[PDB]
Write a protein that binds this DNA or RNA. Structure first.
Length: 297
RNA sequence: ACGGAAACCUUGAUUCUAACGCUACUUCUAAAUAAGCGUUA
């Protein structure tokens, strides 16, 4: 809610379940895990844990940044109250398909999207697959997907201004983000920018109006009811193998189903640093689900 | 405590074999090392 962190990538790989799958943008649990690993490699893991335990710490999923912050399409607002038209069915289905394909909108027109206007996606990155082999066992021919960006398009997140977070981001920018980081993917250059006046006044965390989430956040059990009755959302898995320097064998962490972005709700909630570690495991596995919200008209 | 870790698009291959810058064409055609002896004595 304080800064507007920008990460300019050249090549990246954000696996969505397979080595040959790469999403355009990553989720906040991935960057929180990356921060946790960088902090533990630094040695100042306890300070970052204490900072994350505070309610001031807020993080959001990466969104596209092309001469202005972008926001995920608010799932649950194709509402006919602003899209009531007398056009033919062909144009109605064409605009429905165009809105379904849309995933990100520029900040300057997000409310315009809520006025019935129709916008198209913009060229942000090309996702291409590369085949690689192992020239000692002539059976492995594995494919890796990338997210090669273009047109000065970066990724951005919103988080509090902290010196520990600043230095952690600076160490992240030479350590990569997601995927085969020691192969030419994930690396970025960081820039710190101020939140625009048209955006900072909308980033909220505590009130009872229509809020669109910015983080893949699973609410606490106390207030899930309000997200169930009057909440529009999408369900995203967070499975995978838990990285661990303490166990020789790789353990699958517990599959957890969160709420995607931008899921719309009628009231805000509280996130969880949920322990997705398997049983009998020495150290925790922290999954970050803490929402930053956006007010709607 | 990042659907993540590890992984060479790698090994072997001669732009090589055959093929006369060759066939025909006189440095040729006429031509005396030769002509004039004045005037004075």
């Amino acid at each position: 809610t304080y800064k507007l962190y920008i990460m300019t990538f050249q090549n990246a790989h954000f696996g969505s379940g397979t080595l040959d799958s790469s999403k355009l943008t990553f989720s906040a649990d991935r960057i929180f895990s990356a921060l946790v690993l960088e902090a533990l490699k630094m040695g100042k893991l306890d300070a970052f844990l204490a900072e994350a335990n505070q309610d001031k710490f807020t993080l959001t999923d990466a969104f596209p940044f092309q001469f202005g912050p972008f926001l995920p399409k608010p799932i649950g607002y194709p509402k006919h109250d602003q899209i009531d038209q007398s056009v033919d069915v062909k144009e109605v289905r064409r605009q429905a398909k165009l809105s379904k394909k849309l995933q990100f909108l520029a900040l300057e027109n997000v409310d315009d999207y809520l006025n019935g206007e129709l916008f198209e996606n913009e060229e942000h990155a090309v996702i291409d697959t590369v085949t690689k082999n192992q020239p000692h066992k002539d059976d492995n021919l594995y494919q890796v997907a990338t997210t090669r960006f273009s047109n000065d398009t970066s990724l951005y997140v919103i988080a509090n201004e902290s010196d520990l977070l600043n230095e952690l981001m600076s160490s992240l920018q030479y350590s990569g983000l997601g995927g085969k980081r020691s192969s030419g993917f994930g690396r970025f250059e960081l820039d710190i920018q101020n939140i625009p006046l048209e955006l900072s006044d909308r980033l909220t965390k505590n009130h009872s109006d229509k809020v669109m989430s910015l983080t893949t956040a699973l609410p606490v059990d106390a207030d899930l009811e309000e997200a169930m009755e009057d909440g529009h959302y999408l369900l995203t898995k967070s499975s995978g193998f838990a990285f661990s320097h303490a166990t020789n064998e790789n353990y699958r962490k517990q599959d957890l189903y969160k709420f995607a972005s931008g899921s719309t709700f009628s009231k805000t909630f509280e996130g969880q640093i949920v322990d997705v570690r398997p049983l009998d495991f020495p150290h925790a596995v922290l999954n970050y689900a803490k929402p930053l919200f956006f007010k709607l008209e």
